[PDB]
Every structure is written in C-alpha cells, then in structure tokens.
C-alpha cells in the first residue's frame, strides 16, 4: 500500500 501525502510528517 502506498502512503498518504502526509504520512511522513509523523
């Protein structure tokens, strides 16, 4: 599953 646009911010 690819990650949402903001996952990386957490």
């Amino acid at each position, epitope marked *: *599953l*690819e*990650l*949402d*646009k*903001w996952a990386s911010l*957490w």
Partner: antibody
Amino acid sequence: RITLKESGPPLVKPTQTLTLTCSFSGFSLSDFGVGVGWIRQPPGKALEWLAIIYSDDDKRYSPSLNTRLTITKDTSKNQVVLVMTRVSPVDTATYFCAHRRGPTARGPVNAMDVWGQGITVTISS
Amino acid sequence: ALQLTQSPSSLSASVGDRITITCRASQGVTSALAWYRQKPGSPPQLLIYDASSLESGVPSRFSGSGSGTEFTLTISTLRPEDFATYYCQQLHFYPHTFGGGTRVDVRR
C-alpha cells in the same frame, strides 16, 4: 466559510460518460497541501472513496476505478472535475466532493472537514 | 486493500445512553482516522479528526481514541440528533478507505 457544491447531470445513460464539477469558495487550490476529494454513496450503502487531487496537482484514484476516472482542477475557476467513463446502473449513487486541510497543526489533514450537499446521479437507459 | 471493519454494524439505543463504537483496520494507520455522523439525506459531518481531536464546532459529548489498528468513538450522552449512521475513514494509505458504517436507531 468553506463551501463545496457538486454539479452535473442527474441522469446518465449506461456506457455514456459522467462529468461532475466541484465548485468551491472560502479556500483556494493554491493554499499549500489543500486537497479536494470525491466520495460516492450508493442508495442505502456505505461511502466509497473515489479520488483526490491536491494543490500541486498530485492525484490518486481508487485502484478499482482507476482506468475509468480522471480528476482535474482549474484554479482560475475554483473548480475540480471528475470524469467517470462507461458507467453502469451500479454507478447510481450520490456523489460528494470534500475539502481536505493541508499542513498548517498536522493531524487536521487526517480528515475531510467540509463536504458538499452531494449530487444524486442515476444511471438508466 | 486496507480493510476497515466497523462494530457494531447496527445498534439500538435511547436518548441519554452512553455508546461507544469501533473501527478496526487490517494494518496500522497511526492516528490518521476520522469519524463522521451522517443523517439521512444529508452529507457526512466530521466529528473527530486525527483519531482523537474533536473537530471545532462539534458537541463535547463526542470523543475518540485509538491508534494503529483499534479506534473508538464515544457518545457520553446520546441525543435525538445522534440517531444516524457513523463512519470512520483512514487517510494514512492510498486509497483512503471508509468503514461499512454503524447504524444507530431508536430502541423500543
């Protein structure tokens, strides 16, 4: 403040193409990270995620409907457009477009905060 | 696909009851889970964003908790405006999945 509204044909014919527009105000697609998504709901069924498009034009579609959906945005008009091809009676539902907050204050992107009335589309020959 | 299971799918309660409902995710979605209340004929209305944060303008009776795979929505005291269908949505993975919904009706 932020309001969204869906527009298009309430009656579409099987195989024909469905074009929907989301007109909004109270926010612009030039605001960092802002998104606008499409969610549909068949009569008496659960919500179904369709697609999302952001300020930078980043797009994502539901894998299952990917070869049938195309999402675009026109900043000059504050409108987002969804085009669904070869529709069938099963695509009969209410379509909603919603606003998604961008990073300011992080967690508030984890949701679609403002939705449009939704538009009822019926697929019949 | 990431499966979101809502429990219970259907529920009967009375005004003044305290109900809690859950939404299970097949994979961890961290805190990226939202809750909505949808009344018949009306669009979904955000209650909780980021799993535990009360959305501005929403009654204090609503609350949310959880992280990873387990999440709950609690209504300290149920009002008439609360007999509707509830949905959870994870926005951690694409696609953004919605649960099947929890229907809350009046008990008799």
